[PDB]
Design a protein around this ligand. Structure first.
Ligand SMILES: C[C@@H]1[C@H]([C@H](C(=O)O)[C@H](C)O)N=C(C(=O)O)[C@H]1S[C@@H]1CN[C@H](C(=O)N(C)C)C1
Ligand SMILES: [Zn+2]
Ligand SMILES: [Zn+2]
Ligand SMILES: [Zn+2]
Length: 232
């Protein structure tokens, strides 16, 4: 069973095998008095590991690195943050101090700076226009356009057909668009449509919070966001 917010204490981390050489990591964190789950990705890259997104905080991310070393035993050499919020860059100082080279789009780094969040060390060029993609180790990085945030990236693992949508993508049981404070609601459905068109062979889709599912999460996300728009 995929771990839920109830079976993970704030401070601990779970790994969940998605495919050969692909894992999700799940942590929990207390935000505005309530506890929420949060996903990231781990992708094997030969004898090294690529980390996608922190575990939402310094303490969680340290637990993440110890859990990875224990369970997988390969060094995390690089990490990518998929947008500027604290569930994606919270813990980047820990990663950096531990010798992990941390990456994000220039957009993410600028937004995190202005937000007072931790800032990834290196910039990812080539992701400024909607529809842009670059290769980064064993994955592709895709900027679908503004959605949950104006900078959000999605990550595809072509060898495993795994799409990590991050907070641009919602889990199937969710009916709310979640945190839309920094969202471009006008563009979010279109940005989702780009993901559908660019990665139609994705077999697993992982949201930024909640249970992974199939390709259905993408359309479901567009519906949730458009329902939110209409309600307003
Ligand atoms: C509290 C979080 C986290 C923080 C937030 O909302 O600000 C983050 C630090 O920005 N981001 C968030 C988001 O909407 O992306 C929310 S989680 C959201 C609430 N219900 C949804 C859900 O399906 N859950 C499994 C809990 C997702
Ligand atoms: Zn966010
Ligand atoms: Zn660079
Ligand atoms: Zn989030």
């Amino acid at each position: 069973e995929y771990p839920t917010v109830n079976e993970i204490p704030v401070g601990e981390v779970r790994l969940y095998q998605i495919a050969d050489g692909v894992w999700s990591h799940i942590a929990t964190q207390s935000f505005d008095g309530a506890v929420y789950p949060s996903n990231g990705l781990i992708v094997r890259d030969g004898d090294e590991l690529l980390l996608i997104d922190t575990a939402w905080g310094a303490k969680n991310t340290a637990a993440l690195l110890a859990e990875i070393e224990k369970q997988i035993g390969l060094p995390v050499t690089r990490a990518v943050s998929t947008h500027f919020h604290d569930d994606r860059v919270g813990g980047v100082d820990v990663l950096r101090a531990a010798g992990v080279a941390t990456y994000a789009s220039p957009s993410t780094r600028r937004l995190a700076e202005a937000e007072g969040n931790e800032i990834p060390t290196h910039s990812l060029e080539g992701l400024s226009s909607s529809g842009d993609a670059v290769r980064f180790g064993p994955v592709e990085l895709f900027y679908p356009g503004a959605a949950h945030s104006t900078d959000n990236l999605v990550v595809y693992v072509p060898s495993a057909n795994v799409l990590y949508g991050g907070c641009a993508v919602h889990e199937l049981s969710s009916t709310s668009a979640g945190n839309v404070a920094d969202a471009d609601l006008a563009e979010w459905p279109t940005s989702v449509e780009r993901i559908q068109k660019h990665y139609p062979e994705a077999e697993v889709v992982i949201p930024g919070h909640g249970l992974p599912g199939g390709l259905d999460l993408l359309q479901h996300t567009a519906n949730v966001v458009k329902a939110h728009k209409n309600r307003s």
